[model samples]
Target: ADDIVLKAKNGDVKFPHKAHQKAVPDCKKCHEKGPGKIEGFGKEMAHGKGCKGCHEEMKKGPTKCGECHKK
Candidate 1:
């Protein structure tokens, strides 16, 4: 996973690269466009729908806004 911060209107997400790598163990799980190349994706969809999707499926991970956001 790549260490990157995705900026959003509500807040920015300090994406945990190592954490995701350990848990997911696959880049394609989140990176639809391949590793280290997640462009043209909206914040809400990426975090809310994308990240939330996996979290919900695995029954783990932060769902609340403050969980990932810094605001």
Candidate 2:
């Protein structure tokens, strides 16, 4: 599994890229253009809105801050 870490103020998030891909096999699920193009996106917009929204809709994954963020 590929560990895709997102830098943040509270703590960095280690996302399981490979596992996510297996769950949702679509590039547009997270990426607008392609993978790793979310550098300009903020943590809240990316994780809070994007990631959390999807997880909530799917009834899976984590929504808590400490769930992904490991200080």
Candidate 3:
């Protein structure tokens, strides 16, 4: 779809969903169960697993809080 704006007390995580469409090129990578809204989408899933896990594993985007979440 579009950019996923994950709101948080720390900051709003502006996930660049469009850009990632080409980078990973795999829907299931993030989609998991299906190609729609993510299940259990929260700070834990994003910062620790599904999102950061890939970034750390695949070495794509920035790490740390402020880098991804904007105030």
Candidate 4:
């Protein structure tokens, strides 16, 4: 229930919620700034400096279009 699905015009990104909670216990990484969702969040952020970047920099994570974003 905690996990949420985030997607773009091309596909949907299934957020791994608690799965990511333990690895990146620091919520600030995703939440950004303060709390209650960042003022702006989209492909540029999620795919670059936000989510995808981290996953790309780290190990064992979806880094392809269909990997994170489904068909």
Candidate 5:
């Protein structure tokens, strides 16, 4: 496993991609391919089918705020 670094408009935060890879098990678990037409869905379930669609109840991770959002 290797450590990961991401740069955002606010700042940079360190992440463990390899660790997540082991945890997530599959790409489709957290990502979706091209867009197809669908109807009757909530706003939260529209984009990426809701953040919790994959990560489940784990919203905030071990990181400070301002690291990913400009404030």
Candidate 6:
């Protein structure tokens, strides 16, 4: 729901947004086009809804920086 500005103890990690684009062909994988829903297909296609469906289960991405990072 909100984008975070991450700061490391040393400084910060360079987020390669361009390289990320090159890695994924479809932005829709993480972002959806349509109204919001809590269930059904519409719910299935929601941005953070569907994307986070998996992301929440996996600690691979920043599901919640607070989940691990102290500050």
Model 3: per-residue Cα lDDT over 1-71, one tens digit each: 57878778888888877877777655666776477577667778776768788889887778887888788
Residues 1-71, model 1: lDDT tens digits: 47668777778888877757777655566676466556667765765557777787878888877887886
List candidate 3 stretches off by more than 4 Å.
none
Please give the lDDT score at residue 17 for candidate 4.
78
lDDT for 49 (candidate 6): 48
Q: What lDDT would each prediction earn against the true structure?
A: 0.72, 0.75, 0.77, 0.75, 0.44, 0.43
lDDT of 1: 0.72
Write the candidate numbers in order of decreasing TM-score: 3, 4, 2, 1, 5, 6
User: What TM value does model 1 have?
Assistant: 0.71
Which digits, one per residue and each the tens of the lDDT, describe model 6 over residues 1-71?
13333345634434444444433445644435443442454423422444445556544455443442453
Q: Write the per-residue lDDT of candidate 4 for residues 1-71, one digit (tens) a residue.
A: 56778856878878877677768656677676476667688668877767778877776687887788886
Candidate 5 structure quality by residue, lDDT tens digits, 1-71: 37555444445545566666555435544445433333444444622433334443455343234532333
Instruction: Give me the runs in candidate 6 sitting further than 4 Å from their true place.
Output: 1-5, 8-11, 33-71
Q: What's the residue-level lDDT of 56 in candidate 2?
A: 84
lDDT of 4 at 42: 63
- Ten residues in sequence with the least summed lDDT for candidate 4: 24-33
The deviation in Å at residue 44 for candidate 4 is 0.6
Q: What's the CA RMSD of model 1 in angstroms?
A: 2.6
Please list the residue runs of candidate 1 whose C-alpha ends up more than 4 Å from where it truly belongs after superposition. 47-49
- The candidate scoring highest on TM-score is 3
RMSD of each: 2.6, 2.3, 1.7, 2.0, 7.5, 9.3
**Could you estimate the TM-score for every candidate?**
0.71, 0.74, 0.81, 0.76, 0.40, 0.28
Clashes of 6: 0
TM-score of 2: 0.74
lDDT string, candidate 2, 1-71, tens digits: 48777777779988878767667655666676577677667656765657788888888888887897788
Segments in model 4 whose C-alpha atoms lie over 4 Å from true places: none
